[PDB]
Amino acid sequence: LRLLDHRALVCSQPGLNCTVKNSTCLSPKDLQIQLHFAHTQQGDLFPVAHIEWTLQTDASILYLEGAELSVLQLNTNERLCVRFEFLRRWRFTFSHFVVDPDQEYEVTVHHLPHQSKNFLVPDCEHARMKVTTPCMSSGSLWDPNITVETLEAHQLRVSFTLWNESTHYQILLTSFPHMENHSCFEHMHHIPAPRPEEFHQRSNVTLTLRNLKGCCRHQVQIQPFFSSCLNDCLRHSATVSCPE
Ligand SMILES: *[C@@H]1O[C@H](CO)[C@@H](O)[C@H](O)[C@H]1NC(C)=O
Ligand SMILES: *[C@@H]1O[C@H](CO)[C@@H](O)[C@H](O)[C@H]1NC(C)=O
Ligand SMILES: *[C@@H]1O[C@H](CO)[C@@H](O)[C@H](O)[C@H]1NC(C)=O
Numbered sequence: 064l065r066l067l068d069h070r071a072l073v074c075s076q077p078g079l080n081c082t083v084k085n086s087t088c089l090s091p092k093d094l095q096i097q098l099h100f101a102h103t104q105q106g107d108l109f110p111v112a113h114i115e116w117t118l119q120t121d122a123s124i125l126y127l128e129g130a131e132l133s134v135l136q137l138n139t140n141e142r143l144c145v146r147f148e149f150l151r152r153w154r155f156t157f158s159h160f161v162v163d164p165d166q167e168y169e170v171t172v173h174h175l176p177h178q179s180k181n182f183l184v185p186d187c188e189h190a191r192m193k194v195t196t197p198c199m200s201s202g203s204l205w206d207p208n209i210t211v212e213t214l215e216a217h218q219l220r221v222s223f224t225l226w227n228e229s230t231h232y233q234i235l236l237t238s239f240p241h242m243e244n245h246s247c248f249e250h251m252h253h254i255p256a257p258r259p260e261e262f263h264q265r266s267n268v269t270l271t272l273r274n275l276k277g278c279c280r281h282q283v284q285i286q287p288f289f290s291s292c293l294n295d296c297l298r299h300s301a302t303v304s305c306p307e
């Protein structure tokens with residue numbers, strides 16, 4: 064959770080002069096949050112929360128200085144606030160909060176001196192999220208298209224397409240019985256960082272399976288370690304089903 068730009072924004076409308084800026088975190092109607100995408104001057108692409116709500120005034124003489132817009136990231140408890148500062152119906156919009164893929168947010172509006180709604184951002188498999196800067200940093204553009212072939216002597220041959228980075232990969236084999244989810248075997252295979260010559264080429268690893276009847280469901284997972292996502296890159300898997 065962050066602001067796209069931190070300078071004060073002009074939010075003025077006919078009959079209402081308005082400024083909005085980040086503030087220290089201290090009635091609104093029709094609070095709505097849409098997912099939008101912002102392209103930056105630096106050439107990046109971020110998912111943003113497009114937040115809107117209505118201020119309805121009546122004949123009532125009232126002291127109204129502004130509004131506080133609060134966004135809480137539920138996984139980290141990161142909270143950011145912006146304060147609207149004033150001078151029948153006015154619709155307010157704020158689209159400068161950058162959000163993270165696959166995260167839930169709680170949005171709150173308070174008139175100063177309330178309404179709360181939650182917002183869930185789709186993961187990096189969503190076609191529009193896939194091309195954002197955060198998703199591409201998680202390796203969203205790489206498609207290994209992992210395939211696992213059963214070999215004659217209780218071995219598997221795993222094939223996968225490498226990306227274009229000189230970083231290592233790991234293949235994690237976890238074996239299971241047909242239905243029970245307690246593993247009967249586990250093995251990690253280190254794939255050395257490829258040379259630029261093997262970039263975008265399809266490589267393979269041969270895995271040796273545990274010789275145990277019933278230990279027949281083999282999950283094979285590839286984890287890349289691209290410099291932009293370290294231990295947090297998107298992973299892919301294929302599973303060999305039991306021939307039972
Ligand atoms: C990925 O694997 C599937 C296997 O059925 C195949 O249809 C598809 O064409 C493969 N993709 C590429 C890029 O070769
Ligand atoms: C990696 O491959 C993609 C293929 O679309 C390309 O856009 C990108 O520029 C390549 N990155 C590097 C560092 O060569
Ligand atoms: C066992 O693993 C499968 C994985 O697809 C899952 O659907 C199922 O709910 C799991 N069951 C238990 C008891 O963990």
Ligand SMILES: *[C@@H]1O[C@H](CO)[C@@H](O)[C@H](O)[C@H]1NC(C)=O
Binds near residue numbers: 267
């Ligand atoms: C498996 O991959 C290695 C490169 O990592 C290659 O030398 C070998 O020939 C490939 N094996 C098969 C069966 O294609």
